[PDB]
Subunit: 142 residues, 4 copies
């Protein structure tokens, strides 16, 4: 089994304040589950080869997803910003598989990824524990 | 816009204790978002014609989903029990649309639904406010 | 150190839905901390001889406190109902110490406590793990 | 009644991740209640003349309290850092009243407060809505 524990840091009040509005788990590797403990969010998965997505919305209306998973025994992550209301995590998560439009960024097995939304909000996923079955990462909004 | 606010009541410690492990929103009607306030869970949707699903897991390993939405301006709900680990909410939610295997129970536009899992856990969704754009319902595990 | 993990069961929608509105920790035994994990609430204490209180309010306005702690290496609990708005947990917790009017109930070291409020809400605290440093209890609103 | 809604921003992972470990409400002005909604924390009070405290602990073990309230119809705030484990919020909140050693800081009715802890963690409380009965503030760990 694999687990990924996320700590969420929001740096800049100017960018608004984000909260989770959706949490999905992909059906590969025997699925998995999100849980919360001490302000953190942990994705527990039945094995290597699946993932999950957290969608955030700011009190300014901005919508973004954070994807984390394990691909061939190595952690991966991605961030998608500038989402329309209809582009829910339910739509996004499957796009990393079956030759979907996001599978390429899963295949990179990134230990860190950052991007800045068209509206000017910076986002970063950085793994602090990059090896083993108990993975850790920070999610930073700025 | 439509919103559905859920209060979760767990009645019987013998059945274990459930917590949310996944939350999905379907992409119709301009999507939607889950939010938590005062222990309750609210699904806010851009209009009539979409839905969302909460998946629960008990500390005894039992997995079940609760689906709520609005179909042609009337509320609906459903409960699916006896799920395998790979049957995530991500898999379940879309099954209510595109002539999927659960669309029939969405079309009923039920104001109340109850079922008992094969392992003996009772589940009920009962709307306390059944009309208008601000819908309310209790979710009861027993 | 000692810990007490609580699982909250709410059995009867007719009594309203309760949520936590305050959490205190008494300052003996090197204090302690409340944390949430998987829908449960854990009080971690620096040793034997302290306690904490959760105050709950129903959406019908009813106010009650649940007290749990360790006294001379044995778990204790109490429930106070019919609280006025000014009787916050900050007022209640200390009443269990220093000639306070509730000290006697700490001294009982109860592994179970039941009480019904004047307005008719049943409350129970029942420890499921009653020995050791990792205690567990169900809190039942009926 | 008065309310104060807090949004918590954590800017620097190097200082560790903070979570709430205690929430108190002082017993003047008919008391009050803490509630969570969309990742924010609201203290609702029965009138002017009371307050509440959130105690935070970082995963590095640092302990700090944030106090907010209304004094003579104006918002106030304070931050106390370098707390020992036994200095719980239950100890801190009352120190703002009755010849307590922190009463002076309530009397200042500050709309902003900044302080850096001895171990090097910056803390700020900044009200974004500074007038009326529905107050708003950002809490920034830097
Ligand atoms: C070892 C590993 O990470 N494999 C990845 C695949 O995961 C497997 O997928 C199958 C279903 O096809 C099944 O669910 C297995 O349990 C699961 O481990 C899969 O994610 C592919 C997708 O391109 O990547 C790896 O091969
Ligand atoms: C009015 C209503 O509830 N209509 C339902 C449909 O919802 C619409 O779906 C389309 C896409 O096909 C689009 O997203 C609209 O915004 C949305 O209102 C749809 O849910 C169907 C599915 O069978 O049922 C109703 O017709
Ligand atoms: C062993 C035990 O539970 N003792 C209880 C006391 O707790 C001790 O309290 C002192 C106070 O200075 C100190 O904080 C110790 O750390 C702590 O163990 C205390 O709760 C008394 C209060 O009546 O009851 C027990 O003796
Ligand atoms: C108007 C106001 O903020 N007054 C403050 C006091 O609050 C009053 O306190 C009394 C105490 O009996 C009572 O609870 C009232 O409801 C409440 O408004 C109190 O906080 C004092 C303490 O120094 O400061 C102000 O005067």
């Amino acid at each position: 089994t694999y687990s990924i524990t996320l700590r969420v840091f929001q740096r800049n009040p100017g960018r608004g304040f984000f909260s989770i509005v959706e949490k999905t788990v992909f059906h590969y590797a025997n699925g998995g589950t999100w849980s919360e403990a001490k302000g953190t969010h942990t994705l527990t998965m039945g094995g290597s080869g699946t993932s999950g997505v957290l969608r955030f919305m700011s009190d300014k209306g901005e919508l973004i997803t954070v994807a984390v998973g394990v691909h061939n025994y190595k952690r991966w992550c991605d961030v998608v910003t500038g989402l329309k209301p209809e582009e829910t995590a339910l739509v996004i998560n499957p796009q990393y598989y079956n030759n979907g439009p996001r599978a390429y960024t899963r295949e990179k097995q990134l230990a860190e990824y950052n991007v800045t939304s068209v509206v000017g909000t910076r986002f970063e996923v950085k793994y602090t524990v990059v090896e083993g079955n108990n993975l850790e990462a920070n999610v930073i909004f700025s």
